[PDB]
Amino acid sequence: MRGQIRGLEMASKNSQDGISLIQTAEGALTETHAILQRVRELVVQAGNTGT
Amino acid sequence: MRGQIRGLEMASKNSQDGISLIQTAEGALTETHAILQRVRELVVQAGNTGT
């Protein structure tokens, strides 16, 4: 039982660390995503300005 | 959605630029047109003055 318990507290900490890893990935994908927004604008006025 | 929106603002700016391009063409065709008015006069009195 005790071993299980201490590994469950460690399980909580584990999953929290995993969330944080993901949050790093999501800041990165957030900025990448905003870049793609800017790109999309540049493609649209590339559309008009191609004429 | 957000991408669509920003491309819609860019769509507004696009069409405005297109209008301006046209306005350039329409100043040009305006002056050309006035020339053809003068020409028409010169052809009419070329009509009489041919006699």
Side-chain angles (χ1 to χ4, degrees):
Chain A
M1 184 182 286
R2 183 177 293 171
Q4 292 180 359
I5 295 167
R6 294 178 65 87
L8 293 175
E9 182 62 26
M10 187 62 75
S12 179
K13 184 178 183 293
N14 284 318
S15 65
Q16 292 179 359
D17 293 332
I19 296 167
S20 65
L21 188 154
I22 297 168
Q23 291 182 2
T24 301
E26 291 177 353
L29 293 174
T30 301
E31 293 294 327
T32 301
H33 180 77
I35 296 168
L36 294 175
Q37 299 290 318
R38 181 66 178 171
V39 175
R40 184 177 182 272
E41 292 180 352
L42 295 174
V43 175
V44 176
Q45 65 182 356
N48 190 3
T49 57
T51 61
Chain B
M1 184 182 286
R2 183 177 293 171
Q4 292 180 359
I5 295 167
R6 294 178 65 87
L8 293 175
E9 182 62 26
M10 187 62 75
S12 179
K13 184 178 183 293
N14 284 318
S15 65
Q16 292 179 359
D17 293 332
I19 296 167
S20 65
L21 188 154
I22 297 168
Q23 291 182 2
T24 301
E26 291 177 353
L29 293 174
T30 301
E31 293 294 327
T32 301
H33 180 77
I35 296 168
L36 294 175
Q37 299 290 318
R38 181 66 178 171
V39 175
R40 184 177 182 272
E41 292 180 352
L42 295 174
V43 175
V44 176
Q45 65 182 356
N48 190 3
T49 57
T51 61

